[PDB]
Amino acid sequence: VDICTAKPRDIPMNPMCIYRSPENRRVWELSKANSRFATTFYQHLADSKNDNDNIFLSPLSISTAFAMTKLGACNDTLQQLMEVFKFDTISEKTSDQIHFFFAKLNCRLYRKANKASKLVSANRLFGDKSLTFNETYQDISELVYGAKLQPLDFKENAEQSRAAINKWVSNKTEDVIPSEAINVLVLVNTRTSTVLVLVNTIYFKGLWKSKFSPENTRKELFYKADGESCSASMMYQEGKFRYRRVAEGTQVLELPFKGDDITMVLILPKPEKSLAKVEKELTPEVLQEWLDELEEMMLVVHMPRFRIEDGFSLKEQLQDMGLVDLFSPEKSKLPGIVADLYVSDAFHKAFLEVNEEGSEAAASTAVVIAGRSLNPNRVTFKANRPFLVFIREVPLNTIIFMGRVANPCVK
């Protein structure tokens, strides 16, 4: 039974606790949901960080992790999830249906093979070796999120347990891997013993559709939010890119990878406007508006060559966002997982490496453009100051990664 084809009827979905939201078409709406959480969570994460600190994460990964957890959710815990991750914005739907749409979203995201640009997703459950897990939870987790259940000796050998998990992450999350994201959820019982660990991996390998030439790269000044500056490696190139100059100076620019399914969007505000303001103003609706107004346009592209990485606890922000019960040893309601449970820890680790090739291994490459004469009055895009970055799947319109480049300088 292939999920990709299977209809809603074919895949039962024996849901323990069902919840009705207030008042491909579905797959498209889930992406909106997923994107609403993304930008929101980013704003929270941003306010908790310093302006000149880089930010990077994969919100798709996060949504997926907590969607998996939602499988056993019940009562308020269930609702809070549906609300915090905006799953309830798919008007008049139900807990279990969200998982059908995710099965579809995943298919068109990962199963659809044919690269030049590679997007792979790996999910695994690591549950206590000596417990009896609910078979519906098992099956559905496997079916929908392709997550298998591996037993570990959490009780008597937590040390070796951690090793087992890491040996697996390494085999998945860093062939070369220049961009990835890892999400870990620790589920514990009232006794402070690890019952289950949810692990989500997503990583991307993509060659620029219009690659820069290393020969044209040169050390130049990047201007930090602290008013100082440092030496960045500026990549350079001229060409046809989807672009748009929106509200008060802000430049939006799309750089697609080979395949055209996956692209990198940059958001670069004028020198006199702070990235902070833009971040605060970045509502899901505005963002969508910007992506639409994008039109091909010959221009020059000055963009630094960088490697950013990030790591943070999901707990605080998620709580402030409404997700309380799930972390509350007393309130946490996840009955559908074992035949109590609460989330003790939820951390996220990610990094993105970009260069003349794209999200790929640096290479000794050159470029020759022969009979070209471009209007001396063309637009220029010089990212020598902090700018946002998304890596979205266009067809499905989902934000795979996102972050901020506040300092690309390597020193």
Ligand SMILES: *[C@@H]1O[C@H](CO)[C@@H](O[C@@H]2O[C@H](CO)[C@@H](O)[C@H](O)[C@H]2NC(C)=O)[C@H](O)[C@H]1NC(C)=O
């Ligand atoms: C695992 O949880 C599932 C719900 O996700 C339970 O399945 C239900 O079981 C009850 C009684 O056994 C049936 O009346 C329902 O038809 C089943 N489905 C639903 C959606 O409720 C199941 O009981 C649990 N299994 C174990 C071993 O605890």
Ligand SMILES: *[C@@H]1O[C@H](CO)[C@@H](O)[C@H](O)[C@H]1NC(C)=O
């Ligand atoms: C949770 O939902 C169940 C049935 O879905 C219901 O019986 C119960 O009253 C709700 N609240 C609690 C605290 O169990």
Ligand SMILES: *[C@@H]1O[C@H](CO)[C@@H](O)[C@H](O)[C@H]1NC(C)=O
């Ligand atoms: C992961 O391990 C498998 C063996 O199951 C091996 O075939 C594969 O090459 C490894 N992948 C990476 C990225 O190391």
